[PDB]
Amino acid sequence: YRNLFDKLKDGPLKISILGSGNWASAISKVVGTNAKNNYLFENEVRMWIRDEFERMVDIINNKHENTKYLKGVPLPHNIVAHSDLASVINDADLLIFIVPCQYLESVLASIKEIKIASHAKAISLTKGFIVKKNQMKLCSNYISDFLNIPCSALSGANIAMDVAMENFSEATIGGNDKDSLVIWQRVFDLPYFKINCVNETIEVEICGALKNIITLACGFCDGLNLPTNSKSAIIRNGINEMILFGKVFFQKFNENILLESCGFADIITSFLAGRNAKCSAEFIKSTPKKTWEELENEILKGQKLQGTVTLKYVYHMIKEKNMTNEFPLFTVLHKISFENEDPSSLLKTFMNNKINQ
Amino acid sequence: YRNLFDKLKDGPLKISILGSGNWASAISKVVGTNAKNNYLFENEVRMWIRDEFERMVDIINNKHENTKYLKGVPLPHNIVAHSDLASVINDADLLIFIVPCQYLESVLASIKEIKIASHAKAISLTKGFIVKKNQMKLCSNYISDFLNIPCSALSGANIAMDVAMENFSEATIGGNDKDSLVIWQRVFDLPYFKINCVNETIEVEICGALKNIITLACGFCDGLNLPTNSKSAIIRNGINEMILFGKVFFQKFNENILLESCGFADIITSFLAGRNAKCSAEFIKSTPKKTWEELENEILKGQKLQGTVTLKYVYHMIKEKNMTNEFPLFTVLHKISFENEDPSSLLKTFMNNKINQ
Numbered sequence: 001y002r003n004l005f006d007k008l009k010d011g012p013l014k015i016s017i018l019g020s021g022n023w024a025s026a027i028s029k030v031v032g033t034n035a036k037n038n039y040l041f042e043n044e045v046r047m048w049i050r051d052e053f054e055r056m057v058d059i060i061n062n063k064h065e066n067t068k069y070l071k072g073v074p075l076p077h078n079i080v081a082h083s084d085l086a087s088v089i090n091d092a093d094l095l096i097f098i099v100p101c102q103y104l105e106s107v108l109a110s111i112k113e114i115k116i117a118s119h120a121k122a123i124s125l126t127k128g129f130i131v132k133k134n135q136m137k138l139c140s141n142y143i144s145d146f147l148n149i150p151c152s153a154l155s156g157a158n159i160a161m162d163v164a165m166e167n168f169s170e171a172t173i174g175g176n177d178k179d180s181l182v183i184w185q186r187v188f189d190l191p192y193f194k195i196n197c198v199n200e201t202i203e204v205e206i207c208g209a210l211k212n213i214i215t216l217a218c219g220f221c222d223g224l225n226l227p228t229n230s231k232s233a234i235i236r237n238g239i240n241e242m243i244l245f246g247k248v249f250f251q252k253f254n255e256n257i258l259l260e261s262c263g264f265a266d267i268i269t270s271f272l273a274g275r276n277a278k279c280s281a282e283f284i285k286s287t288p289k290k291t292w293e294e295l296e297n298e299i300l301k302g303q304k305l306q307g308t309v310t311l312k313y314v315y316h317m318i319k320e321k322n323m324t325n326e327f328p329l330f331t332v333l334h335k336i337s338f339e340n341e342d343p344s345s346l347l348k349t350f351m352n353n354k355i356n357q
Numbered sequence: 358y359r360n361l362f363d364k365l366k367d368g369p370l371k372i373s374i375l376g377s378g379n380w381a382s383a384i385s386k387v388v389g390t391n392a393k394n395n396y397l398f399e400n401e402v403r404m405w406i407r408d409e410f411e412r413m414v415d416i417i418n419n420k421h422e423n424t425k426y427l428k429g430v431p432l433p434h435n436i437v438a439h440s441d442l443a444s445v446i447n448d449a450d451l452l453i454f455i456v457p458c459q460y461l462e463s464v465l466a467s468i469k470e471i472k473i474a475s476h477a478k479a480i481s482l483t484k485g486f487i488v489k490k491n492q493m494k495l496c497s498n499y500i501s502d503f504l505n506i507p508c509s510a511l512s513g514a515n516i517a518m519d520v521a522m523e524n525f526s527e528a529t530i531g532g533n534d535k536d537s538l539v540i541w542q543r544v545f546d547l548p549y550f551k552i553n554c555v556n557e558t559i560e561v562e563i564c565g566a567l568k569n570i571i572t573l574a575c576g577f578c579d580g581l582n583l584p585t586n587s588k589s590a591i592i593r594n595g596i597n598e599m600i601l602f603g604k605v606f607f608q609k610f611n612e613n614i615l616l617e618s619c620g621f622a623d624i625i626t627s628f629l630a631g632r633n634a635k636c637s638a639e640f641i642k643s644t645p646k647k648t649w650e651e652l653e654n655e656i657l658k659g660q661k662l663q664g665t666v667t668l669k670y671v672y673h674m675i676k677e678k679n680m681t682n683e684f685p686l687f688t689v690l691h692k693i694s695f696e697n698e699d700p701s702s703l704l705k706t707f708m709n710n711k712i713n714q
Contacts, residue, residue, distance in 0.1 A: 268592065
């Protein structure tokens, strides 16, 4: 088989999900539905889950519910959990990667030691990045290089529970392979989960990664009690610096991708939801009296804040190219977050007599 | 004088403001500051106000405060109120139009019957439109045609009081005349009111007008108790249909203008503030039990909802070109607002098995 249609000649495509978590579980509902309803896909969707606990694999297989991460939501019975990668990846035509980047390297490394089919197509559903030599590597690219298969990217204005509860959501699939996009769209599209396609992954993945800096900034605005005029200004600047970061460091950024679900929509969903803006808001109110680590436990129930991390590496890349002048917001946000800069510096960055041309 | 620099040879430029209202008063603070501080501008800024009441002209001239529309905010003393157009427009080099489009035709008509200098430049600061033969005409264009002077456009993520209270705000000046833009930027730019320029007015003004439809949609989402995933999706679609409306009916729409203050930022400021989303939200909860007129009194303290009006004329232009299929959101929003369609139709419009290419 040299493509998906070659494989479709002999029979339906086998879908496999990698990951355990609220979003992964919610997606298994979406994927399991289409796998059953669509003649192109094999009904059984194999899902690799981490060996957590009463053991998680058995709960899903027997009770058909992720009682830990997606409690209360019945999952489709055609989902089949497995504890080992081999029983999920072998003979899989379509690989859905929903693994947190805090674990992505280990998983990919374990696979490389289990045979991935040459015609197999992959897709990354995790918002974030991988660090390689202090440089930011986007997930679909990293998966696609580490393994040797095309990797598309899915991101959208998505909150695991809203999707799981069948509320109207959208998502954007980015992919350089046109024959992959037609199929991935069918794997995921449902009436409550509408899919648009774009021909590049870079913008889709930068949005999912850097939106957390914008959410962090929104928190800072909330914490400082700033009016909406001012918060909207900060958001705008964050978006434009996100675009510039893509252009400078990843050679391109199509601004039109902000009109897609992974862009503007996911940004406003991200600061109007979760606890992550609240976390940055509470940080700026405490000033230096509390560290991020303390607020992560106190606010996010032990979870690490994605925004602070993304900012650290984004700023580092900016700093080494000596472009901090062209990224005023990201720069001051880094100063305030990690270099004990007075929160008042946020507004002072933009409240000046500098006249734009 | 054939240009502003010809006039600058003989002396400083005379600024005049047309309009009375909270935004007009807030702007007089901005303009009056720069008029004093800048050597290019004559210190006295003449302001034409409607003959309201203790009479309004005298309050501003004596008490230096708009006690009706911008109560509590001291205005600069170099602002000088006048009740008649002639005492404001004659010998004026720079005309700032802050007149509600509910009155714009009368004012422009009265001027045409008072001599506008041939070298004079104008700018429109009112978000909205003018109806001419059931067609939507943008303000700067209408001013520029009715009178015979170039007219720029100013719009931004601006709330009269936030600007008046010297909170960090931004604004976007659009203008086809490059020599006007350099000056308009100086008239308005302050540390709390930062100005970016763009070379076209169409996008700037469509945003200011059609954002109200998007705000109306946001209200509908709030009223229907929809999750953020779903509201963000609706907003996204509203933005894209706003773009399409510009492209179709005004021959062009630069999407990058959404990255400016008048675009995306003003949209999120508009639905996160005011009472206008709340008004549309309360409408959809009442279904047909309450009319818009009732909710305008009840919610907006007697004020007309800009969103409903904009939708009526936007839809009309869409309908006459038979393009309702390409504007699904605007179409269903019109149906729900004016044709007694069930609010459930909002989500049904997008929750389908239609697959996008």
